Ligand binder design. Structure first.
Ligand SMILES: CCCCCCCCCCCCCCCCCC(=O)OC[C@H](COP(=O)([O-])OCC(O)COP(=O)([O-])OC[C@@H](COC(=O)CCCCCCCCCCCCCCCCC)OC(=O)CCCCCCCCCCCCCCCCC)OC(=O)CCCCCCCCCCCCCCCCC
Ligand SMILES: CCCCCCCCCCCCCCCCCC(=O)OC[C@H](COP(=O)([O-])OCC(O)COP(=O)([O-])OC[C@@H](COC(=O)CCCCCCCCCCCCCCCCC)OC(=O)CCCCCCCCCCCCCCCCC)OC(=O)CCCCCCCCCCCCCCCCC
Ligand SMILES: CCCCCCCCCCCCCCCCCC(=O)OC[C@H](COP(=O)(O)OCCN)OC(=O)CCCCCCCCCCCCCCCCC
Ligand SMILES: CCCCCCCCCCCCCCCCCC(=O)OC[C@H](COP(=O)(O)OCCN)OC(=O)CCCCCCCCCCCCCCCCC
Ligand SMILES: CCCCCCCCCCCCCCCCCC(=O)OC[C@H](COP(=O)(O)OCCN)OC(=O)CCCCCCCCCCCCCCCCC
Ligand SMILES: CCCCCCCCCCCCCC(=O)SCCNC(=O)CCNC(=O)[C@@H](O)C(C)(C)COP(=O)(O)O
Lengths: 170, 106, 57, 157, 178, 126, 606
């Protein structure tokens, strides 16, 4: 498994012990034992064959990282070089934030499906996290337009700072 | 009124040519000129199950384990029902029972 | 209020074999059916109630 | 092809000679041919065929255009693409159109009125509300665990 | 279907059409066979007792009154035969009545799949050519220079001749082609 | 107790009063109507049953109907008060009405966003 | 956790297999209808397996098989929400489709496109299973539209029939109005909760959802053919009988009701929505039963029976009882598949004779089909301890003993009594009295491909409600402490409906003609809704189109306004500027006044 519980949290499963009160056999258990023996064994055998071929031909790939160029706040206007660099940085951070919101939404969906009819109570922390990241995303990225830009985001953030500063006066 | 003699003679000629056309619509015995059964349970219901069911089962079970469970939130299920008096297989505690049921009328 | 008795009379001398208490069409047939189902349905309710009074709880 | 302006449709007819020429062009009799009124809607000399759909035509007749139920060379209605058999029907009905409108509107209005009557006079059972424990399920409906709700207390009877 | 309608319907034709339509709506109302037979005998008696009319203006008035009564008392959903227009099975196999001229456009492989049938088809086409020339001459001769003209067609008036415009009647597709 | 027709429910040809009061002029009018119908049917039947025909039968009725419905309208159009009023209302009135409803809706939305009484729940992708 | 997903995806793969076989150029060598029938029965077994698994552990499943596209915070993934509704409807639909496929293999013989017919039926089953098991609203809409288009094709199967083409087009129209409602709901959900995901819908339960529930109600009305959008289903009976059965009896008709069952947690928090669904369902079941009392085509009668029971389900969703509605969905699928299949056997052996006025003596002449028709009719009316007793009776119990509309209650009871009445009309005019068919006897119902599916559907219509209802996990607590006139109400109204319609049929047997009345005219002419609406709406729409849009704007007024006015202005001005006389005296006069004008303009400019 390529995923981890640090970013995809999951409570441990608590299955109950089987207690057959009736004397009839369980067709579910009979069919799953037969299905295991006829299907799961050849599938896992060919999978270990494929994985040992992978181990014979093992290759590695790396996750690319980008250093932090100075932001658009210290970019002179009209100097399109640093503005372009900061704009590409802003676009990359925008895509990262989009995938962050996707991760949070997937976590919320998993919480709801896992809890079922207890989702109103047990998913309070997940819904609170979704609400917080939703409010932050709305405050940083909403209403930018189709041509969203680092300059437009900076203008929106400056307007928000001015209005909250005027609200902080009284 | 009935048939005029113009239409009466015409129709019998059109009907007569209609029988000739429909007779020609028949096929000669050579038409068209084209260029291990066992029983149903032993054979007919057997190879279908091992080809159209068993082989696609292998490909599906390959996909749902080595390409679905390896993904984070593909197969997510609700928690199973836990009643008092049950024992958890994973952790190992016993859920305590209920109270005394003061009403035992029925 | 006009006179429609003589037209209503000729809806009562049809020699079709339909009796006098059903000769008024289908409406009196439905009234017949409803009163036949509800006197008997009342009667079975009365006999059941008399039996329930005769055999107390 | 061989289609020319003299038998192609043209301007609005004024003289009786021009009306007769238009009728001959459209393969109609002079008295049967009647153009649209000259109100400048672009109809021209095209005849005012009666506004009847193609369902009125005899279905047992072997029409030249069997789907359209029309012959060959007879004038085409201006609204044939309305009056084809896949579309608007003008056929006579066993009951009158005003009678159908009145009955349908009366049924709809009657049902609406009695639904309002049943809404203002609802029917129920001689019971109280549904009894629920734990402050009417405060925690399970998504209540705040920190904020203590008003104690909803229920009693036996 | 096989006979073209005339210019106008005669009074006798209209009376017979009304009689047949009234009997059809009578059986649609009656459903049961004995009831239909009784009321059909009654309607036949009504037509018979209005049959011997001499004024003919009162006969047209009686026809108009009978049409008004029929339109008032007609069944909203009358019985229709499945092959009749408006029926359930009407025009059902028009998707299967393929015209005969695609057999010309068939490939030589599909030509060789049915040899004897295509030989008979070629014989029919040759007969069609010769009879077409002869019947064009016949229809040119038979047409009146002026006067009244009906949709009916003349027959073949000499030996070895086919009736004019016979092709779309003789070679029409079967009503149950499959 | 009389059938009342409509443009969408026409009166039956067996119930019209124009047939029972029939005249010799009307009878002969139907006679030449049948004559023209038969002449056109004969011409189409000859063209249909010609075996030397290698193409579709052209239809002058279809050609005339298509030209009347496509190309004759602007040559035969004359501006009147009535069609000018109808064209003006049918080209402007819906536009003005939809402009007014959209402007009030968007003004209400923008004012509610500005002074804060409209809360966006999870609108993050607009 | 692997066998379950493997079984679901194997159901989908076994459904997809005959389509690839049809495109794989070996249909000319194999027996395609038998092959597809075996595929459907194996899919039914592999759907019976998770039915047993869910009956054991009651686990709710969500399987995200493929990731389609990711666009910012909206991530469209192909997922299946395998629930109680999904599993039970998959099993019921697969069993019904197995029966209908075997029946159609018997029925549509001497038809060269039988392989295309079976392929179309299989494609419809694939789209219906996609719609049933879909997890997000985009896949829900994929299944919805696949259902709609396959219904279009299967109604217009006989493309040489103008009536069939017209009925298919109007089915497309009413389904498209439902699609507009569904699109409104989908758009609102994407705008407000960033996803079409049902888990986020569950998290959307806690606010005002009036607009998306109104859109879902419009979608359900359009799909299930309620009042206002009803007549496309009796029009949709124009196609073949197996199409009528499978399409418009078991699967398509319950799709909007299934959608509202899916959105029942949102539905439970909106009293306005619950009240208007209760009213709409009661009105449509009363209206459709009213039509069915005097319909004479047997397929039309059972179509209106289907629509009236859909109104009953619509009422059942009108209260907070979605699981009862789904139970009635299963029982109704069984009943109408069986009834339609029996009527199709009647029609085929009576040589395409479809109306009940040319039938009779069917009890003596077709004992098997008469027995099964009686079984289906009794189970539809609510004969106790049959399959319909475990849903219809509880629906009657809930409407009698919960706080709802009084008029809706009254017309629902009247609709149930009239359901018994029109089932009596079917039984009388088909299975009873004297024969009325043409004399030539062509009855042969001894073919096994006809005989076996009716047996299987009879076993279903006897035992399926029993087995399912005692395997249902206990949800939506019913009430039981109630007096007798509310308890046996369904039995009393069914019995009196049977007896009233029996007496009325005896009156029709009695030798007397009666004057027709506007009540029977209204019922026979479908409430005048098809004639009136289907004439007044297309005529005004197409008249507005041609006589305003095309003509008045494009061919007249835009053409007069921009291009021809520009051309007229330039032509008039070029005539004015080139209307020269060619006289050098006038030219030099022009030059002189040009010189004078230049002097004056220079003098005033300075
Ligand atoms: C003040 C004192 C006088 C008041 C008075 O008498 O007013 C009457 C006068 C109309 O006179 P009338 O009695 O209708 O004339 C009929 C003739 O007597 C008898 O008719 P006739 O056959 O002799 O005339 C032939 C034809 C003569 O031919 C024409 O008139 C040609 C058409 C002229 C333009 C028509 C515009 C309306 C149609 C638009 C269609 C849709 C466009 C795309 C969307 O006349 C007409 O069609 C009659 C209507 C004339 C309308 C003139 C409008 C002038 C102002 C236009 C303003 C801009 C309009 C929009 C432009 C958009 C450009 C992108 O004005 C009004 O009723 C109110 C409108 C006032 C101007 C706005
Ligand atoms: C999640 C779900 C997503 C999808 C949801 C879809 C919902 C809406 C469904 C609408 C269905 C419309 C419909 O009824 O179409 C009928 C239409 C044909 O039905 P028909 O009326 O019997 O037509 C027969 C002909 O008239 C007469 O032909 P015939 O009877 O002799 O039949 C011979 C057969 C013979 O079939 C062929 O020759 C197959 C042609 C393609 C071969 C590709 C080989 C690739 C090899 C790679 C290595 O040909 C056909 O049946 C039709 C030929 C054309 C089909 C083209 C389909 C797309 C092909 C794309 C290929 C891409 C290749 C990429 C590389 O079938 C299709 O359009 C395809 C099947 C339905 C869609 C796919 C299956 C369902 C979705 C699975 C996912
Ligand atoms: C028809 C619609 C089919 C939808 C499901 C497609 C399944 C095959 C597929 O695309 O698998 C994608 C997977 C590679 O994708 P991924 O794992 O995301 O990439 C990272 C690994 N390098 O590639 C693979 O896993 C390749 C190996 C595939 C082995 C056979 C899989 C058979 C799947 C059968 C069930 C398909 C879905 C059934 C439901 C359809 C509903 C319409
Ligand atoms: C208690 C509360 C009660 C509330 C009640 C509410 C009622 C709401 C009703 C909403 C829908 C009303 C309009 C429905 C129009 C349906 C038209 C239709 O189906 O036409 C089909 C018709 C042919 O059908 P027909 O002749 O009947 O059958 C064949 C018999 N030989 O004709 C044709 O096939 C002609 C071909 C089509 C022509 C073009 C049609 C375009 C329509 C565009 C409509 C745009 C606006 C839609 C608005 C929807 C609003 C919901
Ligand atoms: C809702 C939006 C509203 C706002 C947008 C409105 C504008 C939309 C775009 C404008 C479109 C204009 C189209 C002009 C071409 C159409 C007219 C045309 O082609 O007329 C043909 C006619 C000559 O006909 P001809 O072919 O010789 O004869 C028929 C067969 N022999 O031609 C003539 O008789 C003369 C044609 C003259 C040339 C026309 C093209 C050039 C026009 C130049 C306009 C200059 C305007 C500014 C002038 C100065 C300020 C007043
Ligand atoms: C459903 C309800 C249907 C109601 C239908 C009511 C029709 C009954 C009313 C009548 O019978 S009035 C009949 C009027 N017809 C006439 O007067 C025709 C008489 N004129 C004649 O020339 C007759 O002799 C005939 C019978 C037309 C001549 O035909 P011969 O038998 O060739």
């Amino acid at each position: 498994d390529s995923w981890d519980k640090d970013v995809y949290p999951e409570p441990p499963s608590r299955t109950p012990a089987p207690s057959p009160q009736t004397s009839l056999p369980n067709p579910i258990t009979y069919l799953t034992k037969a299905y295991d023996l006829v299907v799961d064994w050849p599938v896992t055998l060919v999978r270990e064959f494929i994985e040992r071929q992978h181990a014979k031909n093992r290759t590695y790939y790396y996750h690319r990282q980008y250093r932090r160029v100075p932001d658009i706040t210290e970019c002179k206007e009209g100097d399109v070089l640093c503005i372009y660099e900061a704009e590409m940085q802003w676009r990359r951070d925008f895509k990262v934030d989009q995938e962050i919101m996707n991760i949070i939404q997937e976590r919320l969906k998993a919480c709801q499906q896992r809890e079922g009819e207890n989702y109103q109570q047990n998913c309070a922390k997940e819904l609170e996290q979704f609400t917080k990241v939703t409010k932050a995303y709305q405050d940083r990225y909403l209403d930018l337009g189709a041509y969203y830009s680092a300059r437009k985001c900076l203008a929106k953030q400056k307007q928000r700072m001015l209005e909250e500063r005027k609200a902080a006066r009284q | 009124s009935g048939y005029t003699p113009d239409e009466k003679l015409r129709l019998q000629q059109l009907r007569e040519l209609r029988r000739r056309w429909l007779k020609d619509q028949e096929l000669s015995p050579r038409e068209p000129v084209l260029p291990k059964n066992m029983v149903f349970k032993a054979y007919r219901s057997s190879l279908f199950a091992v080809s159209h069911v068993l082989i696609p089962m292998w490909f599906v079970h390959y996909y749902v384990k080595y390409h679905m469970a390896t993904k984070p939130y593909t197969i997510v299920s609700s928690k199973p029902r836990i009643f008092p008096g049950d024992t958890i297989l994973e952790t190992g505690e016993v859920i305590p029972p209920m109270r005394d049921f003061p009403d035992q009328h029925h | 209020f006009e006179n429609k008795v003589p037209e209503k009379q000729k809806l009562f001398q049809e020699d079709n074999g339909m009796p006098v208490h059903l000769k008024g069409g289908a409406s009196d047939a439905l009234l017949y059916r409803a009163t036949m189902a509800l006197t008997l349905g009342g009667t079975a309710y009365a006999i059941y109630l008399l039996a329930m009074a005769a055999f107390p709880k | 092809f061989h289609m020319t302006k003299d038998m192609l449709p043209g301007s609005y007819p004024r003289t009786p000679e021009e009306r007769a020429a238009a009728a001959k062009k459209y393969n109609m009799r002079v008295e049967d041919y009647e153009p649209y009124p000259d109100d400048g809607m672009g109809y021209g000399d095209y005849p005012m065929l009666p506004n009847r759909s193609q369902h009125e035509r005899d279905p047992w007749y072997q029409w030249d255009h069997s789907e359209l139920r029309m012959n060959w060379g007879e004038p085409i209605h201006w609204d044939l693409d309305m009056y084809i058999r896949n579309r608007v029907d003008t056929s006579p009905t066993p009951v009158s159109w005003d009678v159908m409108c009145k009955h349908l509107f009366g049924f709809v209005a009657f049902m609406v009125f009695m639904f309002w009557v049943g809404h203002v006079f609802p029917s129920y059972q001689p019971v109280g509300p549904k009894q629920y424990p734990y402050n009417n399920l405060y925690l399970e409906r998504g209540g705040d665990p920190t904020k203590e709700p008003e104690p909803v207390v229920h009693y036996d009877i | 279907a096989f006979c073209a309608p005339p210019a106008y319907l005669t009074h006798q034709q209209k009376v017979l059409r009304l009689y047949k339509r009234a009997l059809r709506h009578l059986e649609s109302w009656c459903i049961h066979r004995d009831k239909y037979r009784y009321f059909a005998c009654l309607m036949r008696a009504r037509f018979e007792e209005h049959k011997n009319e001499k004024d003919m203006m009162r006969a047209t008035q009686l026809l108009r009154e009978a049409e008004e009564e029929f339109w008032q008392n007609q069944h909203p959903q009358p019985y229709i035969f499945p092959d009749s227009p408006g029926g359930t099975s009407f025009e059902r196999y028009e998707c299967y009545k393929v015209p005969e001229w695609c057999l010309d456009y068939w490939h030589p492989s599909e030509k060789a799949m049915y040899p004897d049938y295509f030989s008979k088809r070629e014989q029919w086409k040759k007969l069609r050519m010769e009879s077409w020339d002869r019947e064009v001459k016949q229809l040119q001769e038979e047409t009146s220079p002026d006067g009244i003209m009906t949709e009916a067609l003349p027959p073949a008036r000499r030996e070895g001749d086919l009736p004019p415009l016979w092709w779309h009647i003789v070679t029409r597709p079967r009503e149950r082609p499959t | 107790s009389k059938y009342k027709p409509a443009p969408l429910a026409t009166l039956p040809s067996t119930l019209d009063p124009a047939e029972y009061d029939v005249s010799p002029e009307t009878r002969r009018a139907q006679v030449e109507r049948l004559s023209i119908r038969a002449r056109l049917k004969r011409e189409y039947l000859l063209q249909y049953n010609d075996p030397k025909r290698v193409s579709h039968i052209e239809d002058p009725a279809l050609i005339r109907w298509t030209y009347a419905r496509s190309a004759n309208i602007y040559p035969n159009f004359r501006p009147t008060p009535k069609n000018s009023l109808l064209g003006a209302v049918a080209g402007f009135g819906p536009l003005i009405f939809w402009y007014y409803v959209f402007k009030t809706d968007r003004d209400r939305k923008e004012r509610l966003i500005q002074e804060g009484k409209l809360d966006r729940k999870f609108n993050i992708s607009y | 956790m692997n066998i379950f997903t493997t079984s679901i995806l194997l159901i989908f793969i076994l459904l997809l297999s005959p389509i690839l076989i049809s495109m794989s150029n070996l249909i000319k060598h194999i027996n395609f209808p038998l092959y597809t029938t075996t595929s459907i029965k194996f899919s039914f077994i592999i759907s019976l397996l998770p039915l047993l698994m869910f009956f054991h552990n009651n686990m709710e499943y969500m399987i995200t098989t493929w990731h389609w596209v990711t666009m910012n915070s909206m991530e469209l993934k192909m997922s299946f929400k395998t629930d109680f509704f999904s599993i039970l409807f998959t099993s019921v639909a697969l069993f019904v489709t197995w029966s209908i496929m075997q029946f159609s293999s018997w029925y549509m013989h001497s038809d060269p496109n039988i392989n295309r017919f079976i392929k179309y039926l299989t494609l419809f089953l694939i789209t219906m299973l996609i719609l049933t098991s879909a997890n997000n609203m985009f896949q829900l809409f994929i299944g919805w539209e696949g259902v709609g288009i396959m219904s279009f094709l299967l109604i217009g199967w006989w493309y040489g029939r103008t009536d069939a083409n017209t009925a298919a087009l109007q089915a497309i129209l009413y389904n498209r109005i439902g699609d507009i409602g569904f699109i409104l709901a989908m758009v609102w959900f994407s705008l407000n909760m960033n996803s079409w995901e049902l888990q986020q819908i569950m998290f959307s339960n806690n606010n005002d959802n009036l607009i998306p529930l109104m859109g879902l109600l419009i979608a359900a009305t359009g799909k299930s053919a309620q009042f206002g959008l009803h007549p496309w289903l009796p029009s949709a009976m124009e196609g073949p009988t197996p199409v009528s059965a499978l399409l418009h009896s078991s699967t398509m008709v319950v799709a909007g009701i299934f959608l509202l069952v899916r959105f029942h947690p949102l539905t439970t928090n909106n009293n306005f929505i619950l009240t208007t669904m209760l009213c709409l369902g009661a009105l449509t079941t009363l209206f459709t039963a009213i039509c069915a009392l005097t319909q004479n085509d047997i397929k039309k009668i059972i179509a209106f029976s289907t629509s009236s029971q859909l109104g009953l389900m619509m009422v059942t969703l009108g209260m907070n009882q979605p699981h009862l509605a789904f139970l009635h969905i299963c029982t109704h699928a069984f009943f109408k598949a069986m009834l339609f299949m029996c009527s199709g056997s009647i029609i085929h052996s009576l040589a395409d004779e479809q109306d009940i006025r040319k039938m009779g003596n069917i009890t003596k002449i077709m004992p098997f089909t008469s027995s099964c028709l009686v079984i289906g009719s009794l189970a539809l009316t609510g004969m106790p301890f049959l399959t319909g007793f475990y849903s219809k009776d509880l629906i009657i119990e809930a409407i009698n003993t919960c706080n709802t509309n009084a008029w809706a209650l009254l017309i629902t009871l009247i609709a149930t009594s009239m359901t018994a009445m029109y089932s009596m009309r079917i039984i009388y005019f088909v299975t009873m009295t004297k024969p009325r068919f043409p004399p030539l006897i062509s009855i042969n119902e001894n073919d096994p491909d006809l005989m076996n599916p009716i047996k299987r559907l009879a076993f279903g219509s006897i035992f399926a409600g029993f087995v399912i209802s005692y395997n249902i996990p206990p949800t939506s607590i019913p009430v039981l402490t109630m007096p007798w006139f509310l308890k046996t109400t369904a039995l009393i109204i069914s019995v009196l409906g049977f007896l009233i319609a029996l007496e009325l049929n005896n009156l029709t047997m009695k030798l007397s003609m009666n004057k027709a009345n506007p009540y029977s005219s209204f019922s026979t002419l479908l409430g005048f809704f098809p004639s009136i609406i289907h004439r007044i709406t297309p005529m005004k729409s197409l008249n507005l189109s041609l006589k305003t849009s095309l003509t008045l704007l494009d061919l007249i007024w835009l053409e007069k306004t921009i291009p021809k006015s520009t051309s007229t202005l330039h032509t008039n001005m070029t005539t004015l500027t080139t209307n020269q006389k060619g006289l050098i005296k006038l030219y030099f006069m022009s030059f002189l006044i040009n010189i004078i004008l230049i002097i004056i303009l220079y003098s005033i400019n300075l």
